[model samples]
Every structure is written in structure tokens, then in C-alpha cells.
Target: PTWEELYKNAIEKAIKSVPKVKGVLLGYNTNIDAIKYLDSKDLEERIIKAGKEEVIKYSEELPDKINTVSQLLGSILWSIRRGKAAELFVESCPVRFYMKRWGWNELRMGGQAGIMANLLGGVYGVPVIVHVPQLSRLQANLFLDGPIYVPTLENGEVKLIHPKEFSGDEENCIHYIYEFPRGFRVFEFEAPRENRFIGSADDYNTTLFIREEFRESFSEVIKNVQLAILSGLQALTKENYKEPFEIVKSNLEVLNEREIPVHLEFAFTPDEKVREEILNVLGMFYSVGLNEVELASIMEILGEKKLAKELLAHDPVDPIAVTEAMLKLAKKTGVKRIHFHTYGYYLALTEYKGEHVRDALLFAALAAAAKAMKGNITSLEEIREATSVPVNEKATQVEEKLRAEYGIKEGIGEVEGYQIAFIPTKIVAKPKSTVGIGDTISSSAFIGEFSFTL
Candidate 1:
């Protein structure tokens, strides 16, 4: 099919899939985003004037993008906060770190999961419950006043925590930001060694390093989150109510079952041990039948260069092998549906027989339009136009290759009883921010699909 034809079909399918009911979204790992907006002239001037010493000094203020999936996903959720058919419930650690550094009142409530939850709850008038182990007077007051609120304890105490305290090497924390004209080309920087910045436009030319000391706190925070999820489920069952909340409560049960009807998207820390532990914990509580595990930095960031190279296998452009490797990993871990996203496209393999497969294409179209427009919001025309060229070029190749290799037919067909879909996207001309584009695409697509199922 022509690119224009595929784009047109995707649009029709996506519009029809828009959910009529609001559902609940559970997310984690929130942080404050210090966005530095600049024009082309300013970016060029900074590059020319800034020395290594200046770069090193400024890196201290930049947020750690490497280990934080919530921040990445948070950006997308923030963009799609308005006019959604789902209520968002978030679980994240205390934002004391953000508050101490930025001294901004808004920073106190920031985290990937926390920020997205608050945005949807406050700005969009969606019901939001932030499940944290602790909260300060400032946090409690702000959350109580807004559409977002911390769940209360039996004694009327708010579930909250004190600000985390820790020390780390200077390299553990770094920040950098830059901008260019729309459609301006930027090259990736070469790294002489490990733990140094390999510049990319996506992360504003930043790298993330997590301190060993911080991992303990991170694990504890996750434990609290699991508890929060259990508590919420128990409370909903007790209410035995109708409409959105009741439906949402029932859906949460699907997490513990072998077959999941809705899509469950996830991103995790780079530390393999940490990643495994988190997954295990999640498995203990939720079955996670339909899983979309996003390995966002697998290509660029890894502690071991040998492993990274072996995974890449010298072909970075077409990393279908890498996708297969991840799918295999997901299968071992007991995930039923496997979804992977790269810079080039989104891929999924599942046995789920639902109408939501087309919704994935809708998300790809939306993401392409967002990148082209340099923002999250996009018109149907913009999406249709943005997808025209890339869909024609990339989607055709992907579809043909999959059919030849795996015998998965074109446009959502079954391979060995597993339905597969590969939705290709065009590269953004001049991206305003590459941070949360994936989250925006996946989460919005999920909402689109889940709303219909509900």
C-alpha cells in the first residue's frame, strides 16, 4: 500500500478506537524536569563560548536521564494530560531532592509518575491519587488543593516520606541543554571511554549516572509502591461500586492473571540486577500478561561495551535482531505479549485477539506528528501528512521482511497464533525535546485502546 493510504487507514482505525470511558493508569518513578528552552542563536553561542570547565560545571544541574524511565514516560503523559478518557494514579518517591536543588515550589511535586499524575488530575480534572510513603506539609497542602492527592492513612496521616539524602561522585549527576533551528542536523558525539558523555540531540546532550548509595532508597520506594497498589485494590473491592472506578478495579485484577486484555508498558533501570529485582517484585503482585518493555537506551548506554556491541551486531539501522533478543528475554520472564520500540519503529508480538492492534499504528502516527510539530498536540491532518513518506518507505520494508522471515502477514496477522504488528515512523526534522516522545506515543496509544475495551 502507498504511505498515504496506510496513513489514511490508520487515522480511520484510531478515531474509531477512541475510548468512550475513562480508565485508570498506574505509573511509577517520578522526578522534576528542569526544562531549559533556547533558540538557535543561543544554542550556537553557548557551544562556541563554553569550555570543558564550563560544561563540567553546568553538568551538575542536569537531570539524570539514564536510570529514570518515569521522567521519560512522564513527558508523554504530561503532553496528553488533557481530554483523556482515563484517570491517572501515580506512585513515586519523595521529591525532596528536586526541591532542595531547584528551590521551586512546583519542583516539590515532580517525578516522572508524580508529575504526569498531577498534570492529568489537576489540569484535566481527572481523578488522581499519588501513593507515596511520606509527604511534607508543603506537599500535602499542594496535593490536597489540586485534583491530585496523597492517599490518607487510618489515623488521617498522609502516606508520605522524608526527602532522600545521599552522596555520590560528581559524574553521577550532570546536566546539559541545547537547541537548534527546526530541521537542523545534529551529529552524535564519539565517546573516548565509558561513563563520559556521548552527545545526542535526544537527551539534550546529557547522560545519566545512578549512585550506588541511591539504589537502596530506590528499592525501598518501590516496595512502598507495591504496598500502595495492594491497598488501592483492596479499598476498591470493598467499595463494590459501579462505573469507572469499579471497572478500573476489575482491570487491576487482570495484572495477576495469565491473560491480560490491556497493554502494560514498562521501562526500567539499566542495572541488570536492579531491573530483574523490580520485575520479580512486579511478578509477585501482577501477572503482566500483555507487556511492552521499552529498552530506550539499550543502543547507546551500557556499562559493558562488549555486551552492547554484541547486542547491536554492527547493524544499528536495522536492529530487528535486538528486538528478537528482547522478546526472548520477555518470554523467559513470563510476559505474554512483547512490544519493543526503537528510533525507527514500534514492534509487537502477541497472542491477544483484540481490536487494539490498530491503535498501535495510531500512536505511531501521533508520535511522528508530535516530533514534526515540535510538540505533543497534533491535528489529524498533520498526523496523516507526517506519516505519508516514512510509512511508505519503512513500513513496507518492515512488513515485507516480517512476512518473508516469520510468516506474519501484512497489517496485523498471526504468526504461530501470535498477532504481530510493526508500525514504522519518520524521523523528526528538528525535535524540540526527544526525552518523552516514546512515552507520549505508547501511553496515548494505550489510552486509546483501553478506553474502547472499557
Candidate 2:
């Protein structure tokens, strides 16, 4: 069949299975994203004033004290300069003050779990239970009104209730997202692709706080949950990850007892120790979703630093190399499934063969395209417009490589006793904002796949 025909057929089947999903359990991270659509000329002028040498010094890592505005600008420019996505907790009140004073394009629900909860519960109309760091008014209000539930304590009992129903106004956690487009120039640096640098000025999310209800009465909190999506560990380090890791381990045991499949939403880990820690417990998760950067980080920790560098060496990336990495990761971690999404295509490595694997990914690809083009998603119907977006030609190279390397046909191939699914994604020339698109893609595909299984 033609690529468009396959996309249409797969998307139709995927949409039909949406209502069959039971419920999704989301965790560990939720915040307010203060997004700013950056202007190149404005940034370039500022860089010129700050001087290239000065910006270069603060370019390596985000400094704790953002004493000068140039340092703040430098911290953001550092990531986009290489088209790398990074989320770092900025330990300075000045950063927050600067973000507030500079303002933003708009405020939206941030964090992986928060974005997934909104997409699955509000957009897909699937029931979801989300654990948030703190339920401040702004944070709570950001959740789309639907079957989304939050575990609340009442008289020593756990109650699943909507964020709106929660009575307490907790401390606010806000992250500033400075979004830049592909080829966005700031002095001598030009972004290779659209990406964002997050200045996380929040305490709760970085610490990976577990709600009392989830920590103590987790079984009760997730009594009717069928699937789980654990996330928000991107900012954790050796200093603070032990407690949360233990809690997550216990919860994984509970989920295993309940026969619920858990998928980890992988994010870029700045600390090697934290990444190694997460790798240690990866077997507890039935599946995992990640991008090139996150995948490369794992490769580095797995003693494949050369392979890690190869992942980022190309713009579209090498399909065969990625498949090899996924195979290695799966063999080592005992994770049954791995979903790898990149700029132009998507791939999934599964332990067993099944139908609709490609279909789920096709739907997810469309959903991601819709989210990128529109910047926000509110309904499955909204994704129908994504069909108009052109499918990437570069992805065809991936298809060809898979076919030649492993005899792949119809974007499916079996090698080394594993099933791999691949599909080219539809591209959006300029997205409204680059944030939350990964969460949308991961959640959509994960939920869509289970919609058929369960």
C-alpha cells in the first residue's frame, strides 16, 4: 500500500480503539510552563551587548545565581546553540524574578505527567489519575476539565477527585520555557532544529515529591487503575533520588501485584548517577519512551559512549544504530517494549509480535504533528487536520535502511528475536511551541497500543 493509504487505514483503526482503554495512572511531575516565543533579532542584539566570550563562559551549565541578565540569556542560549533540549532547575530567585518581569506568551500545564494527563483524560476522554507535586490555583486550573482525577486525603482516607475539587491552594511551581526555531540565530550560534531550554525555578518538581496519599495509600489511590505512566525524574540527582526511587520501587511492586503495565516516560538526565539509578529499576517498567538525547544518555551510562555520540551525530539519526541500541537496552533492562521517537520518524521495539503496533504509532505521529502545528490539543478530532501535513521524506531513508539491514517490510521487521515497528512522521514547519510535544507523542502511542491489548 502507499504510505498515505497506510496512514489513513492505521489512523482509522487506532481511533476506533480509543474508547476501549480503561484508565491511565500518571505521576511525579506537574507544573506551570511560562513559555516565551523568542525573537532572533532581539536575542542577537542582547548577545552582541553581552559579548560572545562572556556568554560562552556561562554556556556550559546553568549557574545557580543568575546575577546578570546576560548570564540568564547565556544559560538559555547554551542549549539551543546545539539544538539540544535541556530542563535544569535554576537555583536563583533572580531567574524567577526575571521570568515574571519579562513575561511569557502564555501559561500552560507543564511536565510530562501533567501533559499526558491532560492529553489522555481531557483530549482523548480516557480516565486518568495524576499525581502532582503541588496543586496551586494556577497549576490546578491548567488541567483540562474531564475524567482526570487527583488523589486527595480526607479523614485518613484516599479519594480520587478532580483538581478543581481540591480545596487547598499550595505553593506554585513555575518553569520558564524559552522556545527557539530551527536555524534561529543568536550572534554566531544557529539552532539546527526547534527546541527549548527550561529554567525550572521550582522546588517540588525537582525533588520528585510524592503526595501523601500516593506514598501511604497508593494501592487505595490507584484501586481502579489499569495502566501506569511514571515520569518527572529528569531533574533528580544522587542527593535527592534515593527516597523517591524507593517510593517508586514500592509503587511498582503494587502495580505488579495489580497486573498493571507501567511505562516510564524517559527525560534527559543531567546527572549520570541519576540515569544509572533509573537504569537499575527499568525492569519494573513494562515499557519506556524516549528521544535521541535521552537514548544517548542511557547509552553513555551503559558504557557505549561512542554509540551515544553516534545517536546525535546525524540530524535524522541512524535507524540501524538506534535499533541496535534499543536491542541492547532491552536485553539489559528486561523492558518488554521501547518506543523511540525523533524529528522525522518513530520506532518501537517489542518483545513479542502483535498487530496494530504500526497503527498506534501512526496515530501518535499524527497527534504529535497536530500538537506541534497548533501548540495545544483538546480533542482527538483536532488531530484529523494533521493528515494534511506532509510526511517527512527523510524518514523514507530509515525505512530503506531497515529493509536492507533487516529485511523489513511494511515498516515491520524481526531481528534477534524482537519485533520492531517504524513509521515516518508528519512534519510541521514552525510549531507554536516545542514544549510538551514529546509527552503528547509518548502518551498517545502508549495509550493507543494498550487500547488494543486491553
Best by TM-score: 2
| Local accuracy by lDDT, each model | 0.37, 0.86
| lDDT tens per residue, model 1, 1-454 | 6445555665666555542323233333333333333333433343344343333332322223222223322221221221010111111223223312322111234333443344334433444444332233333433323345433233533332212211111111112211222233211222111111111111111111122222222222222221122211211111222332333333345433423233334443333443443344333332221112224223233333444444432112343454455445455455455555544556666646654665555555554455446443333345545654444354566566666766654456555565666666656644554444444455445444454464
Model 2 is weakest, by summed lDDT over 10 consecutive residues, at: 60-69
The TM-scores of all predictions, comma-separated, are: 0.54, 0.95
Candidate 2 Cα errors over 4 Å, as ranges: 48-51, 58-72
Rate residue 271 of model 1 by lDDT.
Answer: 39
| Residue 43's lDDT in candidate 1 | 32
Number of the top-ranking candidate, with lDDT as the measure = 2
RMSD of each: 12.6, 1.9
Write the residue-wise lDDT of candidate 2 on 254-287 in tens digits: 9998989999999978778999888889999999
The total number of steric clashes, by the backbone 3 Å criterion, in model 2 comes to 0
Cα lDDT for residue 347, candidate 1: 66
